[PDB]
Design a protein around this ligand. Sequence first.
Ligand SMILES: [Mn+3]
Ligand SMILES: [Mn+3]
Ligand SMILES: [Mn+3]
Ligand SMILES: [Mn+3]
Lengths: 196, 198, 196, 198
Amino acid sequence: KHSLPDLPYDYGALEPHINAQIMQLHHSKNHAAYVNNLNVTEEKYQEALAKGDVTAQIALQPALKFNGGGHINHSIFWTNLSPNGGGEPKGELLEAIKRDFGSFDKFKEKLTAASVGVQGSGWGWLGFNKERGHLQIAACPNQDPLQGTTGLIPLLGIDVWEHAYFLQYKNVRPDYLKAIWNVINWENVTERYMAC
Amino acid sequence: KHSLPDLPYDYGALEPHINAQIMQLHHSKNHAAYVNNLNVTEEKYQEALAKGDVTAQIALQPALKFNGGGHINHSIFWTNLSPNGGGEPKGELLEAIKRDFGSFDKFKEKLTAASVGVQGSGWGWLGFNKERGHLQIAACPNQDPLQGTTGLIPLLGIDVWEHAYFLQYKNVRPDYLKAIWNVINWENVTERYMACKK
Amino acid sequence: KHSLPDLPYDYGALEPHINAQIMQLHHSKNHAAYVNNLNVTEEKYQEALAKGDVTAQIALQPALKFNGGGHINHSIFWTNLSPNGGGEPKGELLEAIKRDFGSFDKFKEKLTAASVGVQGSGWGWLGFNKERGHLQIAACPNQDPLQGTTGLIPLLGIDVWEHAYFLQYKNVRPDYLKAIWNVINWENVTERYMAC
Amino acid sequence: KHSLPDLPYDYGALEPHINAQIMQLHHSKNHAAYVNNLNVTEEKYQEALAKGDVTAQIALQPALKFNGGGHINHSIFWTNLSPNGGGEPKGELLEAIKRDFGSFDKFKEKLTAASVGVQGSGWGWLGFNKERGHLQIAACPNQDPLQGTTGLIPLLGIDVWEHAYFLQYKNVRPDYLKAIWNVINWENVTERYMACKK
Ligand SMILES: [Mn+3]
Ligand SMILES: [Mn+3]
Ligand SMILES: [Mn+3]
Ligand SMILES: [Mn+3]
């Protein structure tokens, strides 16, 4: 069965950028539920597959994508952040970013635009296009995961579901986007990029 | 030109069921934003329309539906609530609910389920089906409006976007659904209903 | 593994309403492919499920729904037609239809409207709503199956993908809809209704 | 008012690659229908717009995008074909394709894949990404237009709705994709391309 990963830092480690309450609820309630729901859903799919029940399989897709994606997305997200993060990546990811976006600030501007642009619940992503061999910005609705729905390998995700910022930033998603750069774990993003 | 309607009560009039900060922000920021963008999008659509720019018209659809829907949904939502609402509805509305759902309690359970089941942002709705002549429950994603996307006439809507309840109920949407029944303005729902029988 | 059902009549049995070529291609090529694709897809899903590969599972949903639905839909469709069909159902389905649509002709008008109204590829359906205990008309895009995506139990489906009528009716879907009533196997639809 | 453009060649000018009955029907019936409905939908949108009827505007979106897109896609499609087309493109267009896809053959394989992979009705497109300055392949469902829904400028589109090939190729879409390369008007694609460098 899938499991809720531990946080590589405590709930208030990202203060004052993302407050303690947001982190605690996001991980212990939101992500926790996705995992449990995912396990239930995956087990039902095993029964349906074994029975050759195509209708049941299709009927289960929404739950599998939503909770499955919820697990995939947040799992990556936690590793994308750090109390000791911020700044700019060091090395090959930085050169890749300059190459594909002109500069690191233009890139930030682009990911910010995509993230703030999401109508409703969603995610902003910096991903890697293997078919083309370059970085690419993308946005996904609800919990639809980047790789499973677009083929892009996720490097850095920005959760723009209201639960990710409302307590502290209310409706001002732009301020949440501005603040988050201060806690991005570029070493993790770099490692994800190098794994490509 | 569309405008932000005033709430028919103070921001804290629905406490303790829906707190004041939630109402204040939902109204003055959220709703206001939709109306602002709606007027912006409508004008751009008027320019594209007059120029025969079909590509522009199509590119503007998401913004028009999102903000236009946002204006429609919240305008209705404000009137659906009241510091003097709650309780069980009476009159023909109640009789209609018993016919199509069995009882008011069964209806509540049905709308609660449709509302809690929305993945992501959306709305739960009790609407009227003009084609078949009865009540019908439906759910809508993001700000997609009930009538414009399903043909059903909206009677009562429950906003399940997280901004409508997170500050107070966190991720426990079910508690929000349970609390909101205490502030439903059944008199308004009745008026929207009676307006269909016509 | 899933299998292509045999037709309960020959390819030209529905002439002059749906010509022989349409039927032969529809069954031996179109439906045949959906089954094969479905088996491939279902087997990949078994591997992904066993590996706990949520991304692979999600990435496979389109293929499973499309081909799985393709199999479900056409399987029902073949049983919904007959060289000896047409007319009106006899018994409880007829009373159900009068009750829910006023009359059999109003019902035909409704299913026709829904079917002809499909923008792009799709299906028109007469289904049964168990939650409400009544008949209900619905339309589904591409191969999305009725029950798996709406919960309604399929009774009669009208395939409005262009391959289902173009050879004979070209773009005139309304004429195809008019002609098909002559070969509807109402005994099968009735049996599907009674099974509810 | 939108109108049905004339084809720049006779209905059977693309034979034996795309037969005459397919072209005649595709143009005079299919396309004509989209333009007819587009003019109908546009006027209704103008009435709703002027009345501030947001619900109506939203309810009209599917029809506007479907028929408007249908007009846009086919108008471009007709110009993308020619009895004197086919072969490998030359000039800067060819040089651009080699840069972003490797070679013309690899590009063909890519567009063929995107086109054959469309589930249901749709279009395959070679478009220009103004943001990143290069060519890009994309697929669109039903009649959703490339530019209006993705922002990419259409250079070459391949209609994969069954009406575009069924009469001749039946369900073997791959044979249709292989045949259509013999009638591609690379001079037109070049003009649409050159129009972006600007
Ligand atoms: Mn989240
Ligand atoms: Mn709201
Ligand atoms: Mn078919
Ligand atoms: Mn076409």
